[PDB]
Design an enzyme around this catalytic site. Structure first.
Site, PDB file in Angstrom:
ATOM      1  CD  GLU C  91      61.924 -21.552  43.935  1.00 14.25           C
ATOM      2  OE1 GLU C  91      62.801 -20.675  43.762  1.00 14.25           O
ATOM      3  OE2 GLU C  91      62.300 -22.449  44.940  1.00 14.25           O
ATOM      4  CG  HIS C  95      53.839 -22.544  53.263  1.00 16.29           C
ATOM      5  ND1 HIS C  95      52.721 -23.174  53.759  1.00 16.29           N
ATOM      6  CD2 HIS C  95      54.955 -22.943  53.874  1.00 16.29           C
ATOM      7  CE1 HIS C  95      53.293 -24.109  54.609  1.00 16.29           C
ATOM      8  NE2 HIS C  95      54.457 -23.966  54.755  1.00 16.29           N
ATOM      9  CG  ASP C 146      52.980  -5.015  40.583  1.00 16.46           C
ATOM     10  OD1 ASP C 146      52.236  -4.484  40.936  1.00 16.46           O
ATOM     11  OD2 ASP C 146      52.457  -6.387  39.937  1.00 16.46           O
ATOM     12  NE  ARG C 150      48.860  -7.563  42.820  1.00 16.73           N
ATOM     13  CZ  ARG C 150      48.835  -6.044  43.516  1.00 16.73           C
ATOM     14  NH1 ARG C 150      48.430  -5.981  44.727  1.00 16.73           N
ATOM     15  NH2 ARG C 150      49.317  -5.228  42.848  1.00 16.73           N
ATOM     16  CG  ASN C 151      53.007  -9.321  42.363  1.00 18.72           C
ATOM     17  OD1 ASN C 151      52.492  -9.989  41.696  1.00 18.72           O
ATOM     18  ND2 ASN C 151      52.988  -7.893  42.247  1.00 18.72           N
ATOM     19  CG  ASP C 164      54.245 -11.222  39.090  1.00 12.74           C
ATOM     20  OD1 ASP C 164      54.323 -10.307  38.536  1.00 12.74           O
ATOM     21  OD2 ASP C 164      53.296 -12.064  38.657  1.00 12.74           O
TER      22      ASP C 164
END
Lengths: 289, 297, 297, 278
Positions: C91, C95, C146, C150-151, C164
């Site tokens: 999906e 943003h 992790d 960023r993920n 992620d």
């Protein structure tokens, strides 16, 4: 014709039969000295002894015995010395032999796992030289090149009595199981060629010393293959070399050379693969087709 | 990755046959083994039509083999993951996979390798070698799940080795693996409990081992030839099993009978199999076997 | 595989930025969602230089997401596994990833989205949405390993979701994962026990969550700026932790504090985090959270 | 104007403030009937009631009350009936209203997967429903389940007159209560399907729109549709004032649009939908 002979044996499943004949036709000579009581501790196996006529005699009045045989191949013009993996009490003798026979190279075929059926007869570190007080010899590791399935070491052997020194090249094939065969004909041939490249097998030097544990199975395969390649190379007709006959000749100098039918088959396999390019009597045009 | 190999060092020479996930090629690899300028190798690739799961299994096989060191297990030599296609480089086994090898030994074989069918001694030897490789794999805590003649390889001296791990699963923690969702399974080689409940253990692997012996004694005939997978599934779960191939040695038959016991906790272990055959093996077996190694404690 | 999508249905429109294992693109997908002729999506790919391990995790992420259904977890839409390059379709989060989004909100940003930085109420909302997604992941018995800005992704209504799972591992049987071999790791987001013994748990994930709150209050600044990785590694294992960014709400600082307890057993669970914040959230939260769902039992 | 306004509110982060003003300026009308003691069991929420001046009256002598409002947008030339999700005891009333108001369509926005709505339509073609209290029969004629919405074709029969009518039921399934749709595109895709069905046509009575309370999601749907209509009827589309359109709608039913986020989404959807209908 060696190759057609190979395919015929494979097709009929005769390897065991052929090997059996070779054993039944093999030379039988006395091994009196090897069987002497005072030599019981100089033999690794009670069933593996050097014939009296071809045994290597150490140049000492004490006891000149060592389980080692000189295999002189007249037609091939190459001699080899086959011996058992030295014992703790025979490491000095091993080097005395090396010195006295003027050998330049040693070929070791023990499998590195675990523990080797061979005592540690050479130095592990450059800084830790070895002195064999019994035979007045000093041995130093000069360099060592460890590779995937073999290792090449440079050693300086010094006769402490005359202060003379010699360089000995030591080749150790590490992936050959006792009673077994090499990982592949190619790796075996690569090893054989590396040894030839060093000049350790040259007529200029004494016989190369070859051993493993007993010095007949893997040690015999190595020498048989090398000799058959020599004969094929200096013969007007490569295909005329008869491995069976070459092995029987070699067995005149040491008992039990080549311990299994598999090792016999491998020898054929390696010789055939190593002889693939020997021209013989063919012409450039014929050798092209 | 210490196993990553430069693509420029690999050259595919010819097709060897179809593997679990794609075409296997014979290649020549320059400078991948210290002390050897050139090496003939086997290179595995994955078909473009491979599903997500298949691709995952293909890469997974390469990853688990990195930690294996056993004479009776095909050795990994390296991987080419930079760019496409991905390549898995392994030691070349002179006589290919066991299934193909066995079939090429049939009297009607067109591609006969020029050698007679396996004797009883050669069969026992193959049995012990495969069992040794399996004993090793189980000691490393993996369940194979797909043992079959096609996944075994034959060397220049005819030593058999386990060479495919496309369905291997870790069982360190529990000693078994239960199939979650659905999937394609090698029905003819599976134990009843694995068919019924998707449960895999070293015991179900032992069942497969029995089918591999059947494959050896029938020269890679198809298990339950003439019956569909649906019938095989029903048959085995109901307590049925393969008939002893015509003229099958009794020593081998006794082996299959043990492997095909309905109750998994009644089947012998791989070590037990080797220990059972230990006195009728080649002189070199103790020198290279996992069974006789110090690692087998 | 019912997740397999035909390649021609996917058109890559442009680059969205670098992901864990390769470039992520914005694509247009025709007829992939019943009832909608065209759908804007996110398409993940793997760079040509990806190692075996990296390729394995890239594919693994696609496989594990197939089993996720949580409002605060990015949804998988399908996979193009037939032929190369392999594509993982997800999906589209309007943003982008939380880190980039956060940085574009800096006064000195060049790609500012014409919106001011996150208020306290927004920070708390994000915290609860991330904790909920993590609580869900933990209930499925997976350790993330992790967790970082960023993920995480940001939707059109600014909802944050975990998107992620390149390092996620199963912990069904033991509730933890130990790092056997070596490999690159995100040192500035790791808990002390993870840096020391390579042990990962929902608790070490809690540590990471705290750093993500730190990233939020500093607009994706580098954790432990001024120190090298080696210093960080040593600093954290010796009992050190991140400082509070200027203007970081005191109430959020209290959350970070509890996530950075040296003893993992002292750290709160994700369900506790959500429970702690439940009376200060958007009205829609109980409607979509895993926390309030019947599945959370 | 519209789009620059949107960016202006985003830049200053004033959505809550703008939404706040709207609530303060909103109409406050009497809800005497909805608050009668006998009607409590007819209301899903105490704080959500239809104004007396715009409530739908059931054509019956018993009790004419139902929590539903007629929103008549004169300028856009469209009417809508916003109602709460029917309760188990008001399902008959719901269909009586649909029948008496001659509605051709129903738009349901409850989130699927425990609805704040009673099962008021047949789950299977072979299991029709009969509402004895209002003498109505409902039969499912066809159902097409899509990813985020479902379109059902139903036959409603007034058992007293044996007259029959086809009703189209549209159900958007991924819109959480107090929340916003998964995307402006899916929202607009749904809106357009409803328009294409002809259910919003002037030849029919008002379309009935509901979720749970019939103000939040229900209001967004109607506000967006109305704003797109208004833009279509002007030379300059960007001159439409969404805030004013909402206050106008709030003269007919309280609390249309429950969160500042729904207000923002409306702007997004209207802006994106406009660039689509142009």
């Amino acid at each position: 014709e060696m190759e057609k002979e190979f395919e015929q044996i494979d097709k009929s499943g005769s390897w065991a039969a052929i090997y059996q004949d070779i054993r039944h036709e093999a030379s039988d000579f006395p091994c009196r000295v090897a069987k002497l009581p005072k030599n019981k501790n100089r033999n690794r196996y009670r069933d593996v002894s050097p014939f009296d006529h071809s045994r290597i005699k150490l140049h000492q009045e004490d006891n000149d015995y060592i389980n080692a045989s000189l295999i002189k191949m007249e037609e091939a013009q190459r001699s080899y010395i086959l011996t058992q993996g030295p014992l703790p009490n025979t490491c000095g003798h091993f080097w005395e032999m090396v010195w006295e026979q003027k050998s330049r190279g040693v070929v070791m075929l023990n499998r590195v796992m675990g523990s080797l059926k061979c005592a540690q007869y050479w130095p592990q570190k450059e800084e830790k030289e070895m002195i064999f007080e019994d035979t007045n010899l000093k041995l130093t590791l000069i360099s060592e090149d460890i590779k995937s399935y073999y290792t090449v070491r440079q050693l300086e052997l010094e006769n402490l009595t005359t202060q003379e020194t010699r360089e000995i090249l030591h080749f150790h094939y590490t992936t050959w199981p006792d009673f077994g065969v090499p990982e592949s004909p190619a790796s075996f041939l690569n090893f054989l060629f590396k040894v030839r490249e060093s000049g350790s097998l040259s007529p200029e030097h004494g016989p190369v010393v070859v051993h493993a544990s007993a010095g007949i199975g893997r040690s015999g395969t190595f020498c048989l293959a090398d000799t058959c390649l020599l004969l094929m190379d200096k013969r007007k007709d490569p295909s005329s070399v008869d491995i069976k006959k070459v092995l029987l000749e070699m067995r005149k100098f040491r008992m039990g050379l080549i311990q299994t039918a598999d090792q016999l088959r491998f020898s054929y396999l390696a010789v055939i693969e190593g002889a693939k390019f020997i021209m013989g009597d063919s012409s450039v045009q014929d050798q092209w087709k | 990755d210490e196993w990553e190999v430069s693509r420029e060092k690999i050259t595919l020479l010819r097709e060897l046959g179809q593997g679990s996930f794609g075409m296997v090629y014979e290649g020549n690899a320059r400078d991948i083994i210290k002390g050897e300028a050139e090496t003939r190798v086997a290179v595995k690739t994955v078909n473009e039509s491979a599903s997500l799961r298949e691709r995952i299994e293909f890469l997974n096989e390469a990853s688990v083999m990195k930690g294996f060191t056993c004479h009776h297990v095909v050795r990994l030599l390296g991987v080419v993951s930079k760019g496409q296609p991905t390549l898995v480089v392994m030691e070349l086994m002179a006589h290919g996979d066991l299934k193909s090898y066995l079939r090429s030994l049939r009297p009607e074989a067109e591609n006969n390798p020029g050698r007679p069918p396996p004797t009883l001694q050669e069969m026992i030897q193959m049995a012990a070698e495969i069992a040794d490789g399996m004993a090793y794999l189980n000691a490393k805590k993996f369940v194979h799940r797909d043992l079959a003649a096609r996944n075994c390889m034959v060397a220049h001296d005819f030593t058999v080795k386990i060479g495919d791990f496309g369905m291997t699963r870790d069982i360190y923690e529990t000693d078994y693996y239960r199939k979650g969702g659905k999937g394609l399974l090698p029905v003819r080689w599976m134990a009843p409990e694995s068919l019924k409940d998707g449960v895999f253990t070293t015991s179900s692997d032992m069942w497969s081992f029995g089918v591999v012996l059947w494959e050896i004694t029938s020269l890679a005939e198809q298990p339950y030839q003439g019956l569909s997978n649906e019938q095989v599934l029903k048959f085995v779960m109901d307590g049925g099993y393969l008939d002893q191939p015509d003229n099958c040695p009794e020593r081998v038959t006794d082996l299959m009978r043990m492997c095909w016991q309905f109750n998994p906790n009644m089947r012998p272990t791989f070590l037990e199999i080797v220990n059972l055959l230990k006195d009728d093996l080649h002189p070199s077996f103790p020198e290279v076997s996992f069974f006789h190694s110090e690692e087998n404690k």
